[PDB]
């Protein structure tokens, strides 16, 4: 189910930056899409391994929640970019409460909106956008 | 247009070394992966490096690994390839190319390796 | 490391002949694969990526098929301009690689 959106999630959240051009290719991003989802790798990057791991721990428990391209899924990328810090912690303590995830994920939701302008959270979702009404997807 | 344009290339004994420059322009450099593609006489293409668009990764043939180093500066629009320990095997015409999948390449520069 | 397995390495045909040139991939590339023309002393020129879309100025007599790990290069009415080597290349995952190639000659 939208094997196009985890692979572009995967390539962002690994850190590896020609790996994410790849992708960036593979789903046809432009320039401003592509400034706009590397500033998101970054702060996986800056915020090590386990940023990526325990941020793959929130992502695995929403895929195969009673709730589940999931609806569940959409509304948790969509709270990290545009929501506040409070918003998108609270959601993600409904799936999973363990106080190193929520740890982790108020760190990489504040690296988010101070290192991403509104005009490189509007670009990432405009490229999801792409993503979520692709026929792959 | 969309040129780019490579250099750098010539003689090399075994052991020895060289730096490949390719000057590009036309598109918004930092944005896109580069890569480095040779081509022996009479023989077919070898992917060598690539490269991203601002530096922080790239990847190797295992043949070239440690041996070759691709780099960039986003500033002069300007790919390289510092490649050293040069061998026989890497008598070739070398081609830097735009993106993951080659929709424009340069004219190449040819690169001989003998004692 | 992908493996791509070019078939034939050779082929000779006449001008208004069918043409088709496999290529396998030694596990799945999905459609991320590309196909390239080469003639002597030139460059190669990019004809086909994503399997089968055809690059821009590309004559539609070339169209690419496949998915997985087996794809087709097919050129249905060869001109004299297309005498030439042709490569296909993965770009699923690195490090990228290509096929052997395939010579496409006069046949006489």
């Known amino acids: 189910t939208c094997p196009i959106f985890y692979d572009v999630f995967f390539a962002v959240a690994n850190g590896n930056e020609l790996l994410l051009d790849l992708s960036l290719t593979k789903v046809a991003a432009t320039e401003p899409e592509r400034t706009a989802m590397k500033k998101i790798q970054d702060c996986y990057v800056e915020n090590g391994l386990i940023s990526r791991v325990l941020d793959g721990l929130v992502m695995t428990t929403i895929s195969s929640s009673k709730d589940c391209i999931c609806p569940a899924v959409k509304r948790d990328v969509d709270l990290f970019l545009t929501g506040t810090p409070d918003e998108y912690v609270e959601q993600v303590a409904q799936y999973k409460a363990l106080p190193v995830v929520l740890e982790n994920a108020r760190i990489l939701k504040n690296c988010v909106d101070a290192k991403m302008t509104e005009e490189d959270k509007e670009n990432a979702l405009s490229l999801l956008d792409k993503i979520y009404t692709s026929p792959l997807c | 247009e969309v040129q780019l344009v490579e250099s750098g290339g010539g003689l090399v004994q075994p052991g020895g070394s060289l730096r490949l420059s390719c000057a590009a322009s036309?598109?918004?450099?930092?944005?896109?992966?580069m890569s480095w593609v040779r081509q022996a006489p009479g023989k077919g293409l070898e992917w060598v490096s690539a490269?991203?668009?601002?530096?922080?990764?790239?990847d190797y043939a295992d043949s070239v690994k440690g041996r070759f180093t691709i780099s960039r500066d986003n500033s002069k629009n300007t790919l390289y390839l510092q490649m050293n320990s040069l061998r026989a095997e890497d008598t070739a015409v070398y081609y830097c190319?735009?993106?993951?999948?080659?929709?424009?390449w340069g004219q190449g520069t040819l690169v001989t390796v003998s004692s | 490391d992908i493996q791509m397995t070019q078939s034939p390495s050779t082929l000779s045909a006449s001008v208004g002949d069918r043409v088709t040139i496999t290529c396998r991939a030694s596990q799945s590339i999905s459609s991320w694969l590309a196909w390239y023309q080469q003639k002597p002393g030139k460059a190669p020129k990019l004809l086909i990526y994503?399997?089968?879309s055809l690059e821009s100025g590309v004559p539609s007599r070339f169209s690419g098929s496949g998915s997985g790990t087996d794809f087709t290069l097919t050129i249905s009415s060869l001109r004299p301009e297309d005498f030439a080597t042709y490569y296909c290349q993965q770009y699923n995952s690195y490090p990228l690689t290509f096929g052997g190639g395939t010579k496409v000659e006069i046949k006489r």
């Open positions: 490269i991203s668009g601002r530096g922080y990764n790239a």
């Open positions: 994503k399997a089968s």
């Open positions: 190319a735009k993106l993951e999948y080659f929709d424009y």
């Open positions: 036309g598109f918004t450099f930092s944005s896109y992966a």
